Ligand binder design. Structure first.
Ligand SMILES: *[C@@H]1O[C@@H](C)[C@@H](O)[C@@H](O[C@@H]2O[C@H](CO)[C@@H](O)[C@H](O)[C@H]2O)[C@@H]1O
Ligand SMILES: *[C@H]1O[C@H](CO)[C@@H](O)[C@H](O)[C@@H]1O
Ligand SMILES: *[C@H]1O[C@H](CO)[C@@H](O)[C@H](O)[C@@H]1O
Length: 61
């Protein structure tokens, strides 16, 4: 199975604008002949969540 046959969406915009939140992207899966036959379901990545707007949030006086 070539999982890149099913394209990544774009990464989402960040859950926060600082103090570090998360964001995600997922393959655009369609459950066809190729998917069921080549066991893409067992070995292919479906989700990613991660660090975005990482820096410590600034604090004003
Ligand atoms: C997003 O952009 C940055 C430039 C900051 O100005 C952020 O301010 C912070 O906003 C968060 C919202 O999650 C508040 O919790 C913070 O108190 C505030 O400093 C801005 O939201
Ligand atoms: C998601 O990004 C990967 C690289 O990690 C590509 O192989 C894939 O085609 C999709 O764009
Ligand atoms: C997710 O976001 C990264 C930027 O950090 C892109 O380069 C990638 O193509 C995908 O859109």
């Amino acid at each position: 199975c070539f999982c890149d046959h099913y394209a990544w969406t774009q990464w989402t915009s960040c859950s926060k604008t600082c103090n570090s939140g998360t964001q995600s992207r997922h393959r655009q899966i369609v459950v066809d002949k190729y998917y069921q036959e080549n066991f893409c379901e067992q070995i292919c990545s479906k989700q990613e969540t991660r660090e975005c707007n990482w820096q410590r949030c600034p604090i004003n006086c």
